[PDB]
Ligand binder design. Structure first.
Ligand code: CDL
Ligand code: MQ9
Ligand code: MQ9
Ligand code: MQ9
Ligand code: 9YF
Ligand code: 9YF
Ligand code: HEC
Ligand code: HEM
Ligand code: HEM
Ligand code: 7PH
Ligand code: 7PH
Ligand code: 7PH
Lengths: 54, 143, 54, 188, 534, 102, 189, 125
């Protein structure tokens, strides 16, 4: 129903841009866990970092 | 990190509860605007989403029980407590960019469905991943 | 057998690396975590090449 | 058009594509029967029985295998009319503006016959008066022999020719020898 | 009884003194200094496989009925050239293997010369006193291309025949001497009886003689002016640091020679090239899609596609649209041959250069090179844009316009990017000399500052910041593993270690050896400083 | 290191014997589309390539692996004698040519 | 002296393995929906007759035992033993490549009956799941070989030890996915 | 310092190593020759104008670029003050140093403030 070659490029491009999101989530999740300043507990970090955590 | 492990139980229990309600409400409710029967897609996905949260939660829980009271987890810590060394962070590398270029080659390989392009892209990706890992290991030139 | 490059640690109430815990906040140094940097320019064995053109 | 999965058209562009067939064999023949009732033209080629000829249209003198004397003649016919739009061995070729002559690997022999009997889009029509039955069968013999015969020597690089042999060497061949040179020599 | 063989050889030719100097010549060891050898070895394979190939080949145009080994072509009227080329590959045991070896060797030959020319260009090895080598080499590449062209046009198949048709019709269209030249080359209208005989003799004798002569002159002239080298440690413009001819250079040359020979011998079997049986005999009326020449000839064919219809119709005369193509191809060659001279004109550098220079330190030339590479690649791609269009689903008209416009915009972007990247590479070099190697060990000071540990490659003062070293023309290390700080300190196999005594004893000797090696380079520099003082 | 070199040497010998055996005994004559033993034929040239490649390539690897494991480590420095020649000879070659012309 | 902070690389890899579970959630969803549709007609049972359950057992144990050996290889990395790591990793490479060859042979022995990708919905679903898993296993084997190259080139420091511990995590995950996938396909049919 | 062939080492660090930067006149000459070629592509056999609109757009971009390259335009410094920004010639006090060692910004804190920062009022002077 969609014989065009553009649709395959769409699929593959979507897939690739989705790898970058997991690649970014991996180190945006473990930076919070591991690398924090002395005194910066989980409940001291700003709302922005909580949102990126979730 | 102690409180990071605990907060995952929230979503875990939530997803686990929904994955039960979904299954039982799809197979035993006739609405008239749908057909009776287990969904089989929203059930697997919700069960395994609970699984993901549980996995991460449990791993962080086991990890946090062997860890000392870290200055970042201490309320009244001084800046001079973490006075030692942090880890080793990569200063620079070209291999991320090339590695992305390699994934972009087998991408087009699969798009056009060219066997040679897929094969080359696969070997190109292996090569770049290998170089990325063996970046800081390349021995001094044995002349 | 214990590797020469393995950090000299007491094998009692202490272990340098396991499955899930470590001694640093981040990746362990690939040139030995017990290696003190920087060192004198002599130890590097780098020979600055005096060159003159023309 | 229907069996080869070319119809129905999903979007207007430079050229309609072969894709997955929408209808089966029987359904195709039913649609064909209905269409031919509105004034008929070229019909399907049959054999001794009322069955669609497939492996029987692989040469004039075909019995159980392709005669080497059929591929010789079919080759020259193929080269004269269709080697231009297609490749030498029907690998495909480009046309004016987004159009192309497709690779011939995917078509069965009935589809070949009906392709040159009708003229799909930009393909000219080759009536039975122009290219006789025997000539058409010889063309099919050559097509199906060049497809199904492995290269005598090597891995035929898609049979494209000087452009594919030059990419294997100039980009991949030299790289291996550079890697060998980088291994023997020094980096300083 | 070998000393008596030496005694006889010396008593006659007084050869002891003149060969001591031959076996003691030192050659710089660099992976890029082996690229010319690939061309040499490929050329040797071509001569050997070519001679074998002429024992079965009849270069005649006389039509015959084929009744040979290839049954799918039995009964067709073909030339003697095509029939015998079909007999090499279908009636001679291992004839197809040798034919494919020959063609693969041709491809490798041309690409080896191209890559070698690129090495010469980028590193600046064409400068005084090595311009003669540049001109000789440029003539070598053009003749190599011409040789390959007349080689693939020998079988007289349909694909190669169209190449000859194109070539003949290019010549015939020349402004004044265009139709008179065509009759002098082909011996009449195309095709002609003597054409494949003039092509055969030019291919087996005329060009290879000239080529061998030029190559021999090339090698002798290189051997006479020792070699260039990169400005490393202890290396000046009045010395060569490397390895002597024997026992180390001679053996390495043979090993790499065998490597190339073995690789060509693998390709000759495992991949198909020029499957002439698929194509039929040459016929002026039939043609195929694409029908491109060999990869080295694609740039010329790509030039003809992207040139618009610009015919000049004078009074009762015609300049064909192809003529401008010749003009363009005439410019590209002249620009390439007389490069050292235009280099010198615009730079005003007329010194004796024995030390190479890294591409990153000559951004204008590097950028011009990448600009020219993009030009050549666009010509090559657009010469074969029919196969690109079909396989990659792009408009053929769009491909033509990409070629046309890309030849203006492609080179410009290539220059800009390459220049900026060269300066970037220069900057990264200076950072290391000024501040030291970035360890990557980020540590937190008591105050809370994150600082990265820097490893200085020179002496420091007494306030942290070490006195930066000036650029010395050589590669400066940027990783800490490049100083051997990640070196494996276990000796042994894969499953078992070595005894301790044999292990610690071995680390001591390797440590002493590497220290003394660095000391040689240090001492070299010191002597060189005092030498350059005078 | 001796076992590393000997591996490539033995492998090269096997490759050489393979090439000789395949060149002589392997079915090499042309077989058409339908003919039985088409597979045995279309694999003749590939087999020649595989075996000859193995023989020569392995010998090459063995030779290179010897120089970087057994031949000692050498840095040699040679003095360059190039550029313009000595003036003594310079004015001696132009005076001789001038004498021959005059 | 030094505190006992979490392993940063281990935490990173566990977070990566979590996302790799959801990739198989999609495949399992596709399989179960197709299975429901197949059982509605009663045509599922006919397609399942192409399964070699005994052959899929000994392959499974070949994978499972591989995980065992892998763990031994990691037990040697916690202490400084470079040779203990080197031995067990080689055994696991061999034992994993045997799985891949085994699975490949099953594929070649499954086209002989009529279990093809485009032969049925069952065939499509069978090959998608086990095919992706096969790709993951190949990637795991290549991870092992690259870590074996790292152990050969660098000096065996806790940094290199960590690199081996995480690849073991990947291997365990892939084996666990196989265990869950074999029960679904072969036991439950 | 150390200017070679008109190009400064400050911008191009390897100034005395090779060819380093051309003249503004050769870049302009090449650009205008290219513009001539791009305009000259409009004469030949083609009926379509989807390639004409492609030529004219690129030519326009090239002409705009060459004009920017010729009449080198510069802008002024925005000499403004937004919110709590200080005018140029202000020194920023080391806040963290003033926090650690009571001195400056954290100089005049009373006992009440001292107790608020969990600092017993006894460690005076
Ligand atoms: C390794 C061992 C040798 C292996 C033998 C096979 C390969 C030959 C190698 C040739 C290279 C020799 C090395 C070199 O170049 O240094 C020159 C070297 C002496 O060095 P030199 O003293 O510095 O010479 C420079 C003179 O001052 C100035 O010289 P000149 O002014 O008198 O001119 C001499 C110039 C020639 O004259 C010119 O300069 C031309 C000027 C023309 C202007 C008009 O060239 C020569 O004569 C040099 C020797 C060339 C001999 C040709 C090779 C014969 C091979 C026979 C095999 C047949 C197949 O010459 C030799 O050592 C003689 C070569 C011995 C060949 C004997 C082979 C006979 C077969 C017996 C084999 C038994 C088994
Ligand atoms: C020490 C050493 C081995 C150094 C390396 C020198 C070396 C190999 C240099 C490369 C050779 C050169 C210079 C090649 C030129 C390259 C080039 C421009 C073109 C390619 C040449 C080419 C197309 C060849 C193919 C056909 C062709 C035209 C061949 C030449 C035909 C001729 C004239 C052959 C005879 C000349 C010849 C081989 C001489 C050997 C040299 C010697 C020692 C000659 C001594 C000599 C004798 C003995 C006489 O009797 C004599 C009588 C009358 C006049 C002169 C001489 C004379 O010079
Ligand atoms: C080196 C190698 C390929 C080893 C593999 C073993 C091998 C030779 C296998 C093949 C066995 C063969 C050839 C069997 C057939 C024997 C037979 C009947 C005939 C052989 C004759 C033949 C093939 C061709 C005709 C004549 C011939 C050898 C022509 C090509 C050689 C030429 C043009 C040499 C130039 C002459 C000359 C004055 C050279 C100057 C001095 C030398 C030694 C130059 C060559 C040279 C070499 C060899 C370098 O490696 C090199 C590396 C780095 C920088 C420079 C050079 C360099 O200049
Ligand atoms: C001065 C200085 C240092 C630099 C400035 C450079 C500059 C402006 C130089 C002047 C340039 C100039 C006036 C050059 C002369 C141009 C002329 C009249 C050239 C004619 C030469 C000639 C006989 C050319 C033959 C024609 C050619 C090379 C055709 C190309 C060509 C050939 C040869 C094939 O065989 C072929 C086979 C299959 C497909 C395609 C082709 C194909 O396209
Ligand atoms: C001058 C060449 C130098 C050769 C270099 C040495 C290499 C050694 C290995 C040689 C490979 C052996 C190939 C033998 C080939 C074979 O098997 O021959 C057949 C029947 O042989 C037999 O039983 C007996 C064969 C005895 C001959 C073997 C000679 C090798 C030794 C003894 C000579 C020493 C060499 C000295 C070295 C000197 C070096 C000089 C450079 C004829 O049957 P036929 O029906 O005519 O079929 C034809 C195809 O065979 C044929 O190839 C052809 O291509 C087809 O067209 C077809 O006609
Ligand atoms: C190494 C990286 C390589 C990256 C290169 C990527 C750049 C490629 C751009 C591709 C643009 C193609 C757009 C297609 C446009 C198209 O198809 O139009 C054709 C005419 O093509 C044109 O003029 C377009 C040519 C202009 C292209 C300019 C390319 C210059 C590049 C080199 C520079 C830009 C990118 C730089 C990237 C560098 C990277 C560093 C930053 C004529 O149409 P036509 O075949 O006649 O068909 C229709 C009937 O069917 C139908 O009836 C209809 O009615 C008819 O009207 C007719 O249209
Ligand atoms: C443009 C000139 C042109 C010539 C001459 C030509 N073809 Fe084609 N051919 C085409 C084009 C364009 C198509 C695609 C039309 C379509 O699929 O709608 C095509 C389609 C076909 C198809 C359907 C292809 C497929 O993959 O199913 C076959 C079979 C075919 N051609 C065979 C032939 C044979 C056999 C001859 C001559 C003896 C021939 N063609 C001559 C252009 C040509
Ligand atoms: C027929 C192909 C060629 C062969 C067989 C060949 C062979 C060689 C060899 C063996 C060397 C010495 C080793 C080396 O530096 O790599 C060399 C050097 C050189 N070649 Fe070539 N060459 C060829 C083509 C060319 C071309 C096309 C050019 C130039 C356009 C060229 C210019 C040079 C220069 C300048 C050197 C000197 C390198 C140096 O001394 O620093 N050569 N060539
Ligand atoms: C610069 C070196 C050479 C190059 C680049 C070269 C290139 C080529 C090429 C590309 C072909 C086409 C091969 C094919 O049809 O598959 C060919 C064929 C041929 N070459 Fe060469 N060649 C070279 C040297 C020689 C020499 C020295 C000879 C003879 C003494 C020779 C004899 C032949 C013959 C007879 C053919 C025709 C046989 C055939 O077409 O299969 N070649 N050459
Ligand atoms: C350096 C410049 C080269 C000049 C080329 C001009 C540009 C046009 C190129 C057209 C490309 C056509 C591609 C194509 O149609 O694909 C195929 C046809 O040609 C080829 O097979 C390309 C072979 C190229 C060499 C790759 C070898 C990989 C093995 C590497 C191991 C070391 C068709 O797809 P397929 O083969 O069925 O997978
Ligand atoms: C995104 C990563 C890309 C990975 C590249 C791997 C590409 C594998 C292509 C396999 C094609 C074989 C199909 C075929 O025609 O043979 C068919 C049989 O195939 C099988 O049963 C085994 C296929 C193995 C499953 C691999 C699934 C991998 C999923 C990748 C998602 C793109 C036979 O077709 P036929 O009858 O000849 O028409
Ligand atoms: C068909 C599309 C045509 C494209 C039109 C573009 C042409 C623009 C012409 C501009 C002329 C500039 C003249 C000038 O100012 O002189 C100089 C241009 O630079 C050159 O010397 C040109 C060298 C080109 C040789 C390239 C071949 C070498 C690479 C081969 C590597 C394998 C400028 O020098 P200057 O800045 O004044 O110091």
């Amino acid at each position: 129903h969609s014989p065009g070659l553009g649709s395959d490029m769409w699929i593959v491009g979507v897939g690739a841009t989705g790898i970058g999101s997991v690649a970014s989530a991996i180190n945006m999740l473990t930076t919070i866990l591991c690398l924090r300043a002395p005194g910066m507990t989980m409940f001291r970090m700003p709302i922005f970092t909580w949102n990126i955590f979730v | 990190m102690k409180s990071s492990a605990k907060l995952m139980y929230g979503p875990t229990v939530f997803m686990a509860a929904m994955a039960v309600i979904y299954i039982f409400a799809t197979m035993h409710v006739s609405d008239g605007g749908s057909v009776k029967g287990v969904e089989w897609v929203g059930s697997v996905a919700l069960v395994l989403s609970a699984g993901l949260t549980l996995m991460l939660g449990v791993y962080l829980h086991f990890t946090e029980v062997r860890v000392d009271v870290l200055p970042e987890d201490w309320e009244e810590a001084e800046v001079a407590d973490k006075a030692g060394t942090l880890g080793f962070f990569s200063p620079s590398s070209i291999w991320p960019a090339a590695m992305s270029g390699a994934v972009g080659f087998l991408a087009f390989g699969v798009v056009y469905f060219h066997y040679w392009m897929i094969a080359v892209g696969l070997m190109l990706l292996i090569f770049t991943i290998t170089k990325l890992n063996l970046q800081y290991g390349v021995p001094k030139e044995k002349h | 057998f214990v590797d020469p490059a393995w950090p000299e640690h007491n094998p009692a109430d202490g272990h340098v690396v396991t499955e899930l815990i470590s001694k640093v906040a981040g990746a362990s140094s690939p040139w030995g975590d017990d290696k003190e940097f920087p060192v004198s320019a002599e130890e590097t064995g780098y020979v600055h090449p005096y060159t003159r053109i023309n | 058009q229907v069996h080869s999965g070319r119809m129905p058209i999903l979007r207007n562009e430079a050229q309609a594509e072969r894709k997955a067939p929408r209808y089966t064999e029987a359904q195709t023949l039913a649609i064909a029967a209905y269409v031919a009732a509105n004034g008929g033209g070229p019909g399907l080629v049959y054999n001794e029985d009322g069955t669609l000829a497939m492996e029987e249209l692989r040469g004039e003198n075909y019995d159980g295998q392709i005669t080497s004397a059929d591929v010789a003649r079919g080759g020259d016919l193929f080269r004269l009319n269709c080697a231009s739009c297609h490749n030498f061995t029907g690998r495909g070729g480009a046309l004016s503006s987004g159009k192309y002559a497709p690779n011939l690997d995917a078509a069965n022999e009935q589809e070949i016959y009906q392709a040159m009997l009708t003229g799909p889009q930009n393909m000219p029509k080759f009536s039975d008066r122009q290219l006789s039955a025997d000539e058409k069968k010889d063309i099919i013999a050559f097509i199906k022999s060049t497809k199904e015969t492995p290269s005598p020597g090597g891995y035929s690089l898609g049979s494209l020719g000087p452009v594919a042999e030059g990419l294997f060497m100039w980009v991949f061949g030299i790289l291996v020898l550079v890697a060998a040179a980088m291994w023997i020599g020094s980096r300083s | 009884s070998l000393a008596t063989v030496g005694n006889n050889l010396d008593s006659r030719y007084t050869m002891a003194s003149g060969i001591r100097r031959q076996i003691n010549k030192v050659f710089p060891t660099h992976w890029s200094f082996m690229l010319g050898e690939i061309a040499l070895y490929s050329f040797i394979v071509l001569l050997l496989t070519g001679v074998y190939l002429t024992l079965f080949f009849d270069p005649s145009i006389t039509k015959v009925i084929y009744d040979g080994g290839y049954l799918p072509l039995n009964g067709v009227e073909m030339s003697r050239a095509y029939a015998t080329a079909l007999d090499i590959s279908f009636e001679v045991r291992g004839g197809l293997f040798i034919r494919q070896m020959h063609h693969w060797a041709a491809l490798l030959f041309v690409v080896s010369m191209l890559v070698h020319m690129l090495r010469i260009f980028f590193t600046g090895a064409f400068r005084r006193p090595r311009e003669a080598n540049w001109i000789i080499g440029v003539v070598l590449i053009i003749l190599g291309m011409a040789e390959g062209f007349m080689g693939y046009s020998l079988p007289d198949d349909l694909l190669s025949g169209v190449g000859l048709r194109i070539m003949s019709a290019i010549i015939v269209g020349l402004p004044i001497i265009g139709t008179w030249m065509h009759w002098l080359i082909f011996g009449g209208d195309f095709p002609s009886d003597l054409m494949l005989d003039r092509f055969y003799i030019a291919h087996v004798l005329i060009i290879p003689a000239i080529l061998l002569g030029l190559i021999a002159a090339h090698l002798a002239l290189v051997w006479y002016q020792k070699h260039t080298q990169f400005p490393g440690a202890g290396r000046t413009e009045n010395n060569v640091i490397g390895i002597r001819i024997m026992p180390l250079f001679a053996v390495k040359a043979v090993a790499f020679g065998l490597i190339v020979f073995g690789f060509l011998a693998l390709l000759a079997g495992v991949t198909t090239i020029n499957a002439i049986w698929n194509l039929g005999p040459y016929n002026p009326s039939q043609v195929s899609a694409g029908s491109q020449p060999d990869v080295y000839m694609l740039w010329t064919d790509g030039a003809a596609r992207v040139m618009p219809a610009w015919e000049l119709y004078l009074g009762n005369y015609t300049i064909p649209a192809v003529f401008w193509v010749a003009v363009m191809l005439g410019i590209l060659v002249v620009l390439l041959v007389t490069y050292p001279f235009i280099e010198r004109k615009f730079t005003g550098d007329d010194a004796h250069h024995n030390l190479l220079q890294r591409p990153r330190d000559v951004p204008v030339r590097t950028s011009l090179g990448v600009m020219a590479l993009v030009f050549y690649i666009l010509l090559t791609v657009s010469g074969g844009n029919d196969v690109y269009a079909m396989q990659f689903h792009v408009s053929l008209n769009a491909m033509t316009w990409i070629g046309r416009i890309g030849l203006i915009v492609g080179p410009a972007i290539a220059y800009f990017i390459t220049y900026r990247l060269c300066i970037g590479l220069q900057r990264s070099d200076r950072e290391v000399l000024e501040h030291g190697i970035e360890t990557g060990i980020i540590k937190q000071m008591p105050n809370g500052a994150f600082i990265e540990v820097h490893q200085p490659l020179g002496p420091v003062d007494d306030h942290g910041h070490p006195i930066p070293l000036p650029y010395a023309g050589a590669a400066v290390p940027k990783q800490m593993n490049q100083l051997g700080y990640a070196e494996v300190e276990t000796r042994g196999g894969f499953f078992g270690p070595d005894p301790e005594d044999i292990r610690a004893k071995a680390k001591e000797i390797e440590h002493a050896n590497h220290i003394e090696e660095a000391n040689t380079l240090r001492a070299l520099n010191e002597a060189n400083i005092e030498r350059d003082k005078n | 290191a001796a076992r590393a070199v000997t591996f490539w040497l033995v492998l090269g010998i096997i490759g050489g014997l393979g090439f000789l055996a395949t060149y002589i005994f392997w079915p090499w004559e042309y077989k058409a589309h339908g003919d039985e033993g088409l597979l045995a034929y279309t694999l003749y040239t590939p087999m020649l390539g595989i075996t000859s490649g193995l023989c020569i390539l392995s010998l090459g690897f063995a030779v290179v692996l010897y120089v970087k494991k057994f031949i000692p480590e050498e840095i040699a420095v040679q003095r360059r004698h190039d550029g313009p020649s000595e003036e003594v000879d310079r004015r001696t070659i132009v005076a001789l040519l001038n004498d021959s012309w005059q | 002296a030094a505190l006992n902070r979490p392993n940063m690389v281990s935490v990173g890899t566990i977070v990566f393995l979590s996302q790799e579970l959801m990739f198989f959630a999609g495949l399992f969803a596709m399989y179960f929906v197709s299975r429901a549709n197949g059982l509605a007609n009663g045509s599922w049972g006919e397609q399942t007759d192409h399964l070699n359950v005994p052959y899929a057992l000994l392959i499974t144990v070949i994978l499972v035992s591989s995980s065992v050996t892998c763990q031994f290889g990691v037990f040697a990395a916690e202490r400084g033993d470079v040779y203990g790591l080197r031995k067990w990793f080689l055994v696991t490479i061999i034992l994993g490549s045997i799985f891949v060859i085994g699975q490949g042979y099953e594929y070649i022995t499954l086209v002989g009956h009529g279990l093809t990708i485009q032969s049925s919905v069952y065939g499509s679903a069978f090959f998608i799941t086990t095919g992706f898993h096969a790709l993951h296993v190949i990637a795991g084997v290549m991870a092992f070989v690259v870590v074996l190259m790292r152990i050969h080139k660098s000096k065996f420091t806790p940094a290199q030890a960590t690199a081996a511990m995480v690849v073991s995590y990947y291997w365990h995950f892939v084996d666990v996915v196989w265990i869950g996938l074999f029960i679904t396909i072969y036991f439950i049919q | 310092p150390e200017i070679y062939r008109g190009v400064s080492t400050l911008d191009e660090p390897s100034a005395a190593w090779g060819w380093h930067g051309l003249k503004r006149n050769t870049i302009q000459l090449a650009g205008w020759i290219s513009v001539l070629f791009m305009l000259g592509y409009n004469f030949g056999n083609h009926k379509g104008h989807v390639e004409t609109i492609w030529l004219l757009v690129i030519t326009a971009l090239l002409v705009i670029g060459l004009l920017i390259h010729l009449f080198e335009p510069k802008l002024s410094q925005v000499r403004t003050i937004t919110s709590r920004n200080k005018p140029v010639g202000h020194v920023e006090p080391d806040w963290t140093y003033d926090q650690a060692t009571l001195t400056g910004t954290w100089g005049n804190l009373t006992d009440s403030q001292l107790r608020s920062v969990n600092i017993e009022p006894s460690r005076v002077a």
